[PDB]
Amino acid sequence: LRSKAERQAKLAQRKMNRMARQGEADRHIHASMPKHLFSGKRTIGKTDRR
Amino acid sequence: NGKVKAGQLWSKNKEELTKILGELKTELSQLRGAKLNKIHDLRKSIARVLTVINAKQRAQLRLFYKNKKYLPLDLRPKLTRALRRRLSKEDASRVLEKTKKRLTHFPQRKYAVKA
Amino acid sequence: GKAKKKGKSGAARNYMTRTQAVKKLQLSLPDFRKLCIWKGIYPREPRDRRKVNKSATASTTFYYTKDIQYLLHEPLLQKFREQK
Amino acid sequence: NNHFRKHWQRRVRCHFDQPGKKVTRRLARRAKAAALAPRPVDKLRPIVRCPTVKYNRRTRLGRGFTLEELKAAGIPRLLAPTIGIAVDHRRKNLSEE
Amino acid sequence: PSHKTFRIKQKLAKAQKQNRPIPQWIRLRTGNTIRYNAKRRHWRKTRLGL
Amino acid sequence: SEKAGHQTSAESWGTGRAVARIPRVSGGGTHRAGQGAFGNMCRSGRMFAPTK
Amino acid sequence: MKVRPTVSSSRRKARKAHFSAPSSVRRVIMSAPLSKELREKYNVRSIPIRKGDEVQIVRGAHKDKEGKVTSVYRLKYVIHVERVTREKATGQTVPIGIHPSNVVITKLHLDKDRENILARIKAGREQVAKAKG
Amino acid sequence: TKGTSSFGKRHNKTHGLCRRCGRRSLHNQKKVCASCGYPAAKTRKYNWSEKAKRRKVTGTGRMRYLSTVPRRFKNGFRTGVPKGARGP
Amino acid sequence: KAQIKQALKKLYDIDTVKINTLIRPDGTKKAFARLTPDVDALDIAATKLGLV
RNA sequence: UUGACCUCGGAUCAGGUAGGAGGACCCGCUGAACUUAAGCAUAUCAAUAAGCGGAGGAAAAGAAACCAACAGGGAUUGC
RNA sequence: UGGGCGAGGCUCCUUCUGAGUUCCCUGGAACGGGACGCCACAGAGGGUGAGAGCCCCGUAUAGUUGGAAGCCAAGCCUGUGU
RNA sequence: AGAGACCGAUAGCGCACAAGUAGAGUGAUCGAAAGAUGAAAAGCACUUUGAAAAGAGGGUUAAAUAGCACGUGAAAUUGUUG
RNA sequence: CGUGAGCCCGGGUCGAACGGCCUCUAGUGCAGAUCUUGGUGGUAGUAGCAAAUACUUCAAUGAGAACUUGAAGGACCGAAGUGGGGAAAGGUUCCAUGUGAACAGCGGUUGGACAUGGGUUAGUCGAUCCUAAGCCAUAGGGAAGUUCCGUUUCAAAGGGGC
RNA sequence: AAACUUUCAACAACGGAUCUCUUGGUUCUGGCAUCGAUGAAGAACGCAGCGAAAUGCGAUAAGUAAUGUGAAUUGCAGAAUGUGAAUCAUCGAAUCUUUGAACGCACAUUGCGCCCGCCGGUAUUCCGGCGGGCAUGCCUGUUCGAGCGUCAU
Ligand SMILES: [Zn+2]
């Protein structure tokens, strides 16, 4: 029963290991399409980045 | 062992109930496999003894305040706040004297109409 | 480790003067004298009068605080107020 | 002539509860009849003539009987509502008929 | 910091007691749907917000 | 329900060089942020001509 | 067809009630018929099953196997019968769960409460039979 | 230098924990909660935010006393004990 | 500290000269109670506390 | 001097009451603009949204300082 | 014209309710196919190892146990006018 | 409490799941993704190769062409073979 | 088979429902919307993994060692330090054992990672006390009102003794 | 000729469409009227033999009493069972931490008090703890007062 228990614990980690999370506390959702990179236009005056 | 039944508790008067509570709390404090079952049984026994003591004390207080005008707030009926603030039945059914005379001499009659 | 003031503790709580006792009991002096005579309350003398009251005299009379509280619990006060 | 320039969709009243409301009214009528039995479920109403020149050809039921009508029929005004007769003190009898 | 209030220390104590993986006997219950602790917190990933 | 597809705060990102001009869910830290909203062609949006 | 307005013919509500019923309701749900001998003896068709009853399995792959009920596992709605087991990989024996409607009760674990249940059911059946007769 | 360099200077707190609602929304200098409006007697709610109303409306918490009220109404706010019940 | 020494004296009949207390990171209080030199801590732990 | 009235105060005096929540519907107050008018200060949206106060199981209204002009109807509410 | 009983009825929770697990084939398992029956004021719904009126809970109608609190009510006793 | 010529997991409420959760924001607030092994865990004894993960035999099951990546298993895209 | 949209059959996979005809009904037919959501390519084993001078030998551990450890060397920070301690902020990252995967853009036996345990002891150090700039009650006055002003006032605002 | 690129086919990948299902939504209809100073809604912190969450509960803490049913619960371990199991149903008796309209003053503090009792520590004096109390506006009554406001003597 113990061996079955750690086997279940190890099989519970497969999706987060494929997502390459550092443990089960790694639940950060990053900005894949940030607004500052995907909106607005660049003029001759002040720009938002160099 | 360590289990005290409520039916045994209900027959006992106040002072030996306090004695039994004292022994239960004392042996629990000395206890602080089968010890887990024993401490669980001690906890539930203490809960039962406290319940029985509280119930008997409240019964005595109700008997004491049975014929007094003002009761303690915990012994007063709960109902709701609005039900407590509602007019009493006697005051709500109280009626003026002219209306009383009218209802005395001309009430709603039982009648039928021939077809 | 809390700092403590001087006049708060000790004989200052243990004894109170006749003026303070009368003002605490909310009484006139004749009523206070009658109550003291009946209950058996007598002044007593503190070890150090300056410890109890800062402006204290050989003339002034101190009383026991528990005696004053026992006079407070005395039920003759309600009779006095009713008769007044 | 379409009056749909306000926020009319906020106060559209449908009437899918028409059969349910009819059933509710019938149940209330049964309860009232059972409570008032053996009395009739309604009061006695007079015969009055409709006002205006359009409707004065037709008679209908009024609110209640006048005090002069009750006095001429010999029923006291305090007994009359207690035996199923509606009483109306505002109406007058301007004509004999 | 080292200087902290009692309310702060109490809430940190609750966070410390919550920071654990699920017991292995949980997964063997009948009709169990819990595979890992989905509210696991780490000091570098997500802030407590105190 | 008359509120379906509309219980969200979304503003269009304007004319640009990258993305279509659909209103997009504001904020960050979740998958919903930056996704299209309110359209009948959008996932989790309002249907065309909702039934009354 | 149902007539009473308090009766629902909703499949969704019925399945929710069945799969979230409390334990006292699941006891009545987990009922088994009596054998012909016990039916003629007690004038009772079915009773809720309990541990200590002797049952015969009349449906499934373990048909005609007879044994005593060792556990009434109400959480998976099954019962466990003596010698009605299987072997795992390791060779250990694990019980096979049988639904109580697939068995028939051949001998009752009987006491004062079961006798009272049988008495009420029998008296009610005779009262209904006399009233409708 | 209004971006990354300026973000390194962020080490104070505009808001602390509110005693009434528990959120980290109590403005430390104004001593007024931006969420629930403590220390005002009323709880702050507005009709322009149905979401904010339903985040904290009745039923989202424990219902410690109010959940027992319909049963007491159903049995008619009775008092006492069943006849023949064991007790004092 | 006063309640702790009173509780020890009344329940277990243990005399202490001083008590230092801390509150642990899990939220429970820990008390170090130093005993009087006449009584032996090893003897008390063996008999009463059962810590052997 | 002694007491009475009147007005105004004190008390951890005796006994009570209010606050907050909820607010779909209900009673009031306060009060927009987008929109529609070619634009637009009348107007429309709208005596609406948002904001504030106060109730109940319904609320409100209600037993004519009414309608009428008739051979007169007869509190209120709703279809 | 005041008082007091009141048969009986209504509202609410509680005990109980009809009939195959008969035979053959397929199938891991009949709730499938075939044969013979039964119940039905119940052939609504759900479960049970695949489409089950009769395996189980329920379903229909009359009732039938036990308890509490109200309401209505045919009638019947009485005081009589200060 | 009962229903539907409604939707059937990108639909239907944002939420069929420890969902107003996780996460983000100083804050007011913003706000998801995510259902399905099998009738029954019977969730692979034992041998063998590997440091292990695993593989191979051999087993369970009606089926592993259902192996807790789990019903069915499309297309884009990829490997081997012809 | 049909001009066609399509319809029908065979073979394979699969496991619980589905179809023809006549009417009824609609959230009913996609290649485009820099469409929405999800998934997947070429680019491409490519760009790149080049600031902060720098690494080497032996032994041990281990399946496996440039980035583990011990010793032996060679160097750097050079006291405004790559040192020793604190305030803010974080909250257990601290310590000891053990460790598959994931993470540490190379590896990894190592780790601030993962798993289980342990660790913070005060009359004298701080908080607690005082007041500063400032803020909030009370009297009273505004405001339809949520509330605004007011902090010494146009207040019977209290202490002590015989 | 191979390799490479492309095309076609079978099998295997990737991915999760399609089909079938549904303890969920959505809409309609019927019935009912019941929150709070006798402390609500909300918040925080705790409570299980072995739980982080969800659920339930409050130091009587995955609960006590009472009524009913009548033999479980179950992932493991350990025990109890005719006053009798149960993560059962019902529910009229209770318990109900710190808070919150939140009420001794405060609160970014587990800070500082006042009154009356009790307990423990040598204790009339000291130190800790506990019990009951001490918010504001307003109403009625009580009692104590103030004012050449005013009456009689
Ligand atoms: Zn708040």
DSSP D61-76: E-S-B-HHHHHHHT--
Please report where in the chains the tokens 């109590």 appear, as a residue: H26
Task: Please state at what angle helix C18-25 crosses helix C29-39, rounded to 10 degrees.
Answer: 100
Contacts of H87 in chain B (CB under 8 A): 10, 55
Token code pair at residue G94: 């694990």
Q: Are H26 and H18 in contact (CB under 8 A)?
A: yes
Q: Distance from the CA of H27 to the center of ligand 1, in angstroms?
A: 10
H31 annotated ligand-binding residue: no
Q: Judge contact between G47 and G124, C-beta under 8 A.
A: no
> Which amino acid makes up residue I34?
R
User: C40: phi > 0 → left, psi -120 to 50 → alpha, else beta; which?
Assistant: left
G112's tokens:
């004062």
Cβ of residue G91 lies below 7 Å from strand L: yes
> Is E16 within 8 Å of I26 (Cβ atoms)?
yes
Beta-carbon count within 10 A of G118 CB: 19
Q: Do H and B touch, counting CB pairs below 8 Å (3 needed)?
A: yes
**Cα H44 to middle of ligand 1, angstroms:** 9
Contact present, F24 and F30 (Cβ < 8 Å): no
DSSP B86: S
Nearest CA in chain B to H72: B79
Q: How far apart are the first and last CA of chain H?
A: 79
Annotated resolution, angstroms: 2.6
I27 contacts E10? CB cut-off 8 A: yes
Picking from F40, F42, F35, F36, the residue whose alpha carbon sits closest to that of residue F50 is: F40
Q: How many angstroms separate the CA atoms of G104 and G60, rounded?
A: 13
Helices (H) then strands (E): counts for chain B:
6, 0
Considering only CB atoms, B113 lies closest to which of D40, D79, D82, namely D40
The position carrying tokens 């007063």 is B76
Both tokens of C35, joined, read: 């109550």
Task: Answer whether A29 sits within 8 Å of F31, measured CB to CB.
Answer: yes
Instruction: Name the H helices within chain C.
Output: 11-14, 18-25, 29-39, 49-52, 65-73, 76-83
| Cα of E5 vs its chain's centroid, Å | 21
Question: Can you tell me which residue has the tokens 């002219």?
Answer: B98
In DSSP notation, E1-48 reads --S--HHHHHHHHHHHHH-SPPPTTTTTSTT----S-TT---TTTS--
Closest CA to C11 of C51, C45, C56: C51
Cβ neighbours of residue H55 closer than 8 Å, sequence gap 6 or more: none
Coil, helix or strand at residue I21: strand
What single DSSP character describes residue D84?
A: T
* Bases on strand J under 7 Å from any protein CB: 15-24, 44-53, 56-57, 64, 67-75
Nearest nucleotide (CA of F1 to C1')? N26
| DSSP code for B74 | T
| The pairing of beta strand C15-17 with beta strand D59-61 | unpaired
Strand L nucleotides within 7 Å of a protein CB: 1-3, 10-15, 17-18, 20-33, 40-46, 58-62, 68-69
- Token pair of C54 as six digits: 């800062």
Q: Mapping DSSP to helix (H, G, I), strand (E, B) and coil, where does residue G104 land?
A: strand
Question: What region, left, alpha or beta, does residue G18 occupy, with left being phi > 0 and alpha being psi -120 to 50 degrees?
Answer: alpha
| Number of C-beta neighbours around residue D80 at 10 A | 21
Q: Are D80 and B108 in contact (CB under 8 A)?
A: no
Residue whose tokens read 């077809």? B115
Collapsing DSSP to helix, strand or coil, C20 comes out as helix
Phi first, then psi: what are they for A42, rounded to 5°?
-100, 125
Residues 6+ apart with CB under 8 A from H45: H52, H53, H56
HSE on the CB side for G89, CA within 13 Å? 0
Tokens representing residue B81 in the block: 């706040």
Helix H or strand E encompassing H25: strand H24-27
- Among D80, D50, D46, residue whose Cα is nearest residue D61: D46
Task: Assess whether H15 (CB) lies less than 7 A from strand L.
Answer: yes
Query: Closest Cα partner for E23 from A2, B56, G20?
Result: A2
d(CA G86, CA G58): 18
DSSP G58: -
Among chain B residues, the shortest Cα distance to D76 is held by B106
Residue H16 labelled as part of a binding site:
no
Other beta carbons less than 10 A from residue A1's beta carbon = 7
**Residue in B21, B27, B25 with CA at minimum distance from that of residue B56:** B21
The burial class, CB within 10 Å (0-12 / 13-18 / 19+), for C30 is exposed
Structure tokens at H74: 């159903």
Residue A29 makes CB contacts below 8 A (sequence gap 6+) with F29, F30, F31
Neighbouring CB atoms inside 10 A of B72's CB total 9
Sign, CA dihedral D32-D33-D39-D44, equals positive
By C1' distance from the Cα of F32, the closest nucleotide is L32
Report the distance separating Cα F46 and Cα F39, nearest Å: 6
Name the method of structure determination.
Answer: cryo-EM
Between CA A32 and CA H43 the distance in angstroms is 38
> In Å, what is the CA distance from E47 to each residue of B49, E6, H28?
47, 19, 20
- Alpha carbon G112 to its chain's center: 19
Instruction: Report how far residue H33's alpha carbon sits from residue H20's, in angstroms, rounded to the nearest whole number.
Output: 9
Paired strand residues for G48: G31
8 A C-beta contact, residue D86 and residue D65 = yes
Say whether the peptide bond before residue D38 is cis (omega within 30 degrees of 0): yes
Bridge partners (DSSP) listed for residue D49: D59
Spatial distance from the CA of H75 to the C1' of M4 (Å): 74
Look up residue B105 and give its amino acid: H
Contact between H46 and H52 (Cβ < 8 Å): yes
Task: Name the minimum distance, in Å, from the CA of A8 to any CA of chain F.
Answer: 29
Cβ-in-10-Å burial (0-12, 13-18, 19+) of F45 comes to buried
Peptide bond into H39 cis (omega under 30): yes
Q: Which residue has the tokens 């809430």?
A: E11
The C-alpha angle with vertex D29 and arms to D27 and D35, in degrees rounded to 5, equals: 105
Nearest to D62 by CA among D47, D52, D42, D51: D47
- The structure tokens listed for C16 are 């109170």
Residue D62 burial (C-beta neighbours within 10 Å; 0-12, 13-18, 19+): middle
- Residue labelled with tokens 């209306």: B99
Closest CA to D84 of B111, H58, F27, A31: B111
Which nucleotide minimizes the distance between its C1' and the CA of B53?
A: N94
Task: Write the single-letter amino acid at B72.
Answer: P
Q: Hey, is B25 helix, strand or coil?
A: helix
Asked whether C56 and C49 are in contact (CB, 8 A), the reply is yes
Distance (Å, rounded) from C-alpha F26 to C-alpha G127? 72
The continuous run of DSSP H or E covering I30 comes out as strand I29-35
**Rounded to an integer, what distance in angstroms lies between the CA atom of residue I48 and that of residue G71?**
44
Nearest residue to C6 via CA among C54, C58, C56, C55: C54
Work out the angle at residue G27's Cα, subtended by the Cα atoms of residues G25 and G33, and round it to the nearest 5 degrees: 125
Structure tokens at H9: 């200077």
> Do the bridges between strand G93-95 and strand F23-25 make them parallel or antiparallel, or are there none, so unpaired?
unpaired
- Alpha-carbon span H14 to H29, nearest angstrom: 8
Amino acid identity of H76? G
Of E43, H18, H31, G58, residue with least CA distance to A22:
E43
- Which residue pairs from B68-77 have beta carbons closer than 8 angstroms and sit at least 24 positions apart in sequence? B77/H79
CA distance B57 to B75: 12
Q: What angle do CA B107, B109, B113 make, to 5 degrees?
A: 155
Contact C67, C41 (CB under 8 A): yes
CB A27 within 8 A of CB E46: yes
> What's the N-to-C CA distance of chain E in angstroms?
12
Alpha-carbon span D50 to D58, nearest angstrom: 6
Strands G103-107 and G54-57 come out as antiparallel
